[PDB]
Amino acid sequence: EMPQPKTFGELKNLPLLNTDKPVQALMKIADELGEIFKFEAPGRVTRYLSSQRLIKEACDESRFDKNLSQALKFVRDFAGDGLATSWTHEKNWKKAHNILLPSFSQQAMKGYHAMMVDIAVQLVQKWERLNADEHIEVPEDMTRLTLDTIGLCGFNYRFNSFYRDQPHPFITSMVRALDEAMNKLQRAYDENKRQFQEDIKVMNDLVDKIIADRSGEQSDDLLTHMLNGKDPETGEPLDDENIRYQIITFLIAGHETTSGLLSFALYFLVKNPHVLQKAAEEAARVLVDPVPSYKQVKQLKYVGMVLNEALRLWPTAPAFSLYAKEDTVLGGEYPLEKGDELMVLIPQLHRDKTIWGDDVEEFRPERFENPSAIPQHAFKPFGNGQRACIGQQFALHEATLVLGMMLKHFDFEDHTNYELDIKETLTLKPEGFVVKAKSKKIPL
Amino acid sequence: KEMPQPKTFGELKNLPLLNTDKPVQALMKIADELGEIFKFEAPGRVTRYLSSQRLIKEACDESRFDKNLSQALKFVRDFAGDGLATSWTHEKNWKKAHNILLPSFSQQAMKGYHAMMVDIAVQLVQKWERLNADEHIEVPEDMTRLTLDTIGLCGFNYRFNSFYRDQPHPFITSMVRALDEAMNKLQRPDDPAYDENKRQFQEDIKVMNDLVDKIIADRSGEQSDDLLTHMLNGKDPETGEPLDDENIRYQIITFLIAGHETTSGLLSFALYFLVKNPHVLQKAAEEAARVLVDPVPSYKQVKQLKYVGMVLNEALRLWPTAPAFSLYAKEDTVLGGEYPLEKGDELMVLIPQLHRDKTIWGDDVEEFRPERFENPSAIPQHAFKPFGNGQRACIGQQFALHEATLVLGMMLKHFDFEDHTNYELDIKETLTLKPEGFVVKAKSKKIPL
Numbered sequence: 001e002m003p004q005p006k007t008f009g010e011l012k013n014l015p016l017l018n019t020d021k022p023v024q025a026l027m028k029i030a031d032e033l034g035e036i037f038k039f040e041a042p043g044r045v046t047r048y049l050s051s052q053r054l055i056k057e058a059c060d061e062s063r064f065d066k067n068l069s070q071a072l073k074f075v076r077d078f079a080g081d082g083l084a085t086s087w088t089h090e091k092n093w094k095k096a097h098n099i100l101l102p103s104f105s106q107q108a109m110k111g112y113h114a115m116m117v118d119i120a121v122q123l124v125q126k127w128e129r130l131n132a133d134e135h136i137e138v139p140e141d142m143t144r145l146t147l148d149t150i151g152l153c154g155f156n157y158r159f160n161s162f163y164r165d166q167p168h169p170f171i172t173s174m175v176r177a178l179d180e181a182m183n184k185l186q187r188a189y190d191e192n193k194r195q196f197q198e199d200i201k202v203m204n205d206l207v208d209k210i211i212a213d214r215s216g217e218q219s220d221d222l223l224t225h226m227l228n229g230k231d232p233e234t235g236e237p238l239d240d241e242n243i244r245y246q247i248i249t250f251l252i253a254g255h256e257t258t259s260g261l262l263s264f265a266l267y268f269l270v271k272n273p274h275v276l277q278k279a280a281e282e283a284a285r286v287l288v289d290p291v292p293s294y295k296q297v298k299q300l301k302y303v304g305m306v307l308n309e310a311l312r313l314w315p316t317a318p319a320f321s322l323y324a325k326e327d328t329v330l331g332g333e334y335p336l337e338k339g340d341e342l343m344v345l346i347p348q349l350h351r352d353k354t355i356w357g358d359d360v361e362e363f364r365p366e367r368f369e370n371p372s373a374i375p376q377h378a379f380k381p382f383g384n385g386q387r388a389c390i391g392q393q394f395a396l397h398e399a400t401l402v403l404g405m406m407l408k409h410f411d412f413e414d415h416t417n418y419e420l421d422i423k424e425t426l427t428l429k430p431e432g433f434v435v436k437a438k439s440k441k442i443p444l
Numbered sequence: 445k446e447m448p449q450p451k452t453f454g455e456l457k458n459l460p461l462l463n464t465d466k467p468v469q470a471l472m473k474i475a476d477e478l479g480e481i482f483k484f485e486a487p488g489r490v491t492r493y494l495s496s497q498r499l500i501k502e503a504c505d506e507s508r509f510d511k512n513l514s515q516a517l518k519f520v521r522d523f524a525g526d527g528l529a530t531s532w533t534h535e536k537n538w539k540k541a542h543n544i545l546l547p548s549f550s551q552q553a554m555k556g557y558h559a560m561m562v563d564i565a566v567q568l569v570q571k572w573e574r575l576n577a578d579e580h581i582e583v584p585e586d587m588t589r590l591t592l593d594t595i596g597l598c599g600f601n602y603r604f605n606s607f608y609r610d611q612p613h614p615f616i617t618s619m620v621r622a623l624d625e626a627m628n629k630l631q632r633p634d635d636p637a638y639d640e641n642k643r644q645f646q647e648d649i650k651v652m653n654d655l656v657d658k659i660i661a662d663r664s665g666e667q668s669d670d671l672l673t674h675m676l677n678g679k680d681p682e683t684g685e686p687l688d689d690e691n692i693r694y695q696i697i698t699f700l701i702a703g704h705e706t707t708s709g710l711l712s713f714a715l716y717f718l719v720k721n722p723h724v725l726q727k728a729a730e731e732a733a734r735v736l737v738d739p740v741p742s743y744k745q746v747k748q749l750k751y752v753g754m755v756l757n758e759a760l761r762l763w764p765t766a767p768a769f770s771l772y773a774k775e776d777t778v779l780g781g782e783y784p785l786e787k788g789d790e791l792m793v794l795i796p797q798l799h800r801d802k803t804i805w806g807d808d809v810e811e812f813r814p815e816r817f818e819n820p821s822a823i824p825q826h827a828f829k830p831f832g833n834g835q836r837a838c839i840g841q842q843f844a845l846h847e848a849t850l851v852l853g854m855m856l857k858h859f860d861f862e863d864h865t866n867y868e869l870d871i872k873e874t875l876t877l878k879p880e881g882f883v884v885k886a887k888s889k890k891i892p893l
């Protein structure tokens with residue numbers, strides 16, 4: 001008999017998710033109930049996994065495949081059959097996967113590096129231009145950077161977020177749409193539908209317009225590869241409708257999780273001054289030029305360790321879903337039937353004391369001193385297998401470049417003694433996180 | 445710009461400076477005179493010894509430097525082969541064995557080894573409990589009995605039974621003679637006078653090979669919780685390949701060498717500093733009595749011995765028992781903004797001098813103060829390197845520190861120690877460091893096991 005949290009009569013466990021912080025509530029349930037517990041809703045059953053012992057079996061692609069959770073099903077209403085919201089057996093997943101994978105390689109980052117520096121310089125210039133006693137709204141500025149970076153590197157579109165306060169009309173529709181998708185998980189609603197469809201049209205209208213605009217001009221961006229790339233398997237290119245879904249997918253997935261990572265990384269740095277000093281030291285020693293090169297970013301070994309430890313404690317895409325391909329027994333004790341669903345609670349996996357030791361809550365980038373020392377399937381901030389994050393190298397290159405430049409150019413002060421408050425949408429971010437930056441007066 | 449260099453001997457350059465019984469300590473004295481970097485030239489060899497954290501932090505940049513096999517390690521390779529410690533990073537068998545063996549060496553994997561560690565530690569305590577009045581302890585001798593038997597039992601389920609002997613195992617007779625010959629060959633041509641040295645050297649290699657490959661063939665098919673199991677059954681996730689039997693023998697020899705000698709030196713130096721600093725010993729003995737409340741220490745209790753762990757780190761600061769490692773420049777690069785290096789140029793990290801960097805540690809670098817390690821994260825990057833650097837760092841670091849903390853904790857729980865001879869520190873140099881002739885008296889506290 002599998003552990004299961006408290007129930008609400010006919011609603012079963014569903015009201016447990018009627019909260020602003022469902023991931024963190026699920027983590028507390030995992031602390032109480034252990035490596036696996038069942039979660040029941042009206043017409044829905046799933047099992048949350050928290051231990052490396054069970055998650056390593058769940059990551060066996062011969063036994064389990066990616067499932068679309070209820071959140072992803074609602075995102076699919078505007079993300080379509082993009083890479084993140086399509087089933088593995090759908091023709092358009094493997095097609096887009098083969099077409100888009102060469103545009104996301106570590107090798108392909110060399111072409112994106114210049115445009116990444118463009119936005120990163122804007123962030124540094126904004127902070128250099130602050131007056132005395134002014135402070136920085138960290139997740140707000142990190143979102144300005146990651147959104148503009150994926151806009152420029154992806155489709156040569158400048159959201160110009162550092163010129164605004166009210167964000168782009170596309171971005172306003174996106175957050176409202178994602179909010180509606182989250183609310184339907186916790187959920188008079190006739191107005192919500194009119195709002196939801198208006199936000200979908202706004203995203204579709206801008207995207208489909210840029211697709212038609214892109215003339216025949218060639219750029220160093222994702223749009224070029226999508227318009228001209230052919231799947232080696234089927235020999236087919238993506239049609240314009242799926243291209244639009246990929247644009248929406250990459251605009252969503254390409255910015256918010258990365259901004260959360262940078263925000264959490266800076267949080268842990270100002271809360272652990274010895275780690276900050278080590279990271280600032282490497283940045284000063286490695287970033288010897290006014291503009292960082294691609295090779296210099298790859299040299300920021302310790303900064304990359306800081307980001308991985310931030311991804312360990314607070315993975316900004318905190319869960320993914322799987323389904324059993326056939327009848328199977330997980331870990332030798334809980335039999336599963338074909339189609340049974342599993343949820344991987346990534347933050348709990350990253351706190352497995354049998355893997356990481358007893359000090360799992362401490363921020364120690366030195367855990368990632370040797371990448372090979374980490375056991376298999378113990379660290380999964382970017383998902384698993386062929387359905388893993390295609391943009392992993394993009395996010396980590398952008399985050400290493402930006403965090404390196406931040407540490408090179410400024411000293412940071414946790415002037416409010418900020419108390420960590422993690423806002424949950426479908427991703428995680430430290431709400432209200434603010435710092436002061438004292439410029440080191442190093443020119444660009 | 446112009447690099448310092450110690451005195452030369454004509455055509456022999458600096459080589460006769462290493463024609464001594466204590467070369468590491470001679471190099472440390474040279475570093476005191478010449479500073480953070482000096483050139484060392486020999487016939488057909490050039491290297492640069494680094495002593496400051498300022499330069500060593502650059503040398504530890506794995507994008508600019510990779511582990512080099514020093515001349516000593518090249519001679520050890522004649523019987524350690526392409527084991528982990530004597531292989532190049534670019535050799536297929538390094539990354540293969542590296543990926544296969546890391547899961548048996550984590551701090552988590554120590555839980556499985558803990559019981560066998562207690563087995564040997566109890567034998568040590570029982571030996572000292574059974575000494576008669578006025579009898580004394582030969583500290584490095586007994587510490588080596590412990591570390592060898594521990595690496596024998598947790599590693600390959602083999603009992604060297606060192607506490608039942610005076611004359612050590614024929615494998616060790618082969619091993620120490622082999623290490624001595626490898627050290628001696630640094631001064632040497634291949635003329636006829638050395639034919640007997642070669643004949644002796646090959647006899648010692650065969651003894652080690654004969655014992656090891658026999659146990660490999662013996663391991664029956666029985667399953668054990670040891671290193672040998674992972675080597676026989678483990679597969680590299682990258683290549684999908686397991687280690688072949690020839691490399692497995694090199695890993696066993698490597699683990700027998702590297703798994704006991706540096707750790708015994710650590711315990712010997714730690715006990716040395718404890719009896720020379722009675723206030724530190726009392727503080728460490730108090731923690732042992734407060735934490736080790738059971739007749740046998742648990743794995744979690746050993747992790748609680750925070751001050752004992754600080755004592756061991758400070759012992760590793762002053763006398764790191766693997767006192768140097770070698771690096772080579774991957775490409776042309778400039779060290780410290782003043783010393784240009786070409787691709788393939790060699791560096792030696794003089795760890796004991798790095799650990800005496802006054803800009804890092806303060807002016808009292810020679811004093812034994814475990815409180816330096818109250819918060820280990822306060823230490824700057826690449827300032828404390830007793831276990832090497834990067835992907836070529838000591839794989840057995842967690843093994844050595846768990847064994848040493850467990851044993852030293854039990855020693856401090858069960859005995860009071862007296863420096864009855866007022867021992868004068870005499871550091872014997874093989875390829876590792878140990879305090880030769882260090883003896884103490886133990887007065888039992890009469891706490892049963």
Ligand code: HEM
Nearest residue numbers: 083084253254257258317320381382383387389390391395
């Ligand atoms: C630190 C930042 C990021 C994190 C933590 C992250 C996390 C993840 C995770 C956990 C998954 C698997 C989800 C599942 O199995 O349901 C995933 C998939 C995906 N991510 Fe990310 N991601 C990040 C950045 C990015 C970026 C920058 C992009 C776009 C450039 C991106 C695009 C995608 C796509 C397209 C998929 C679906 C892949 C497929 O199934 O074909 N991600 N991501």
Ligand code: HEM
Nearest residue numbers: 528529702703706707710766769831832836838839840844
């Ligand atoms: C206090 C005790 C120890 C010290 C001070 C120490 C020190 C070191 C150092 C400095 C290196 C790097 C050598 C180089 O870069 O050329 C190293 C590597 C190594 N050590 Fe240790 N060690 C200790 C204990 C152990 C133990 C107990 C084991 C086995 C269980 C072990 C096995 C190894 C191996 C296999 C390597 C090579 C790692 C590689 O390159 O893949 N050592 N050690």
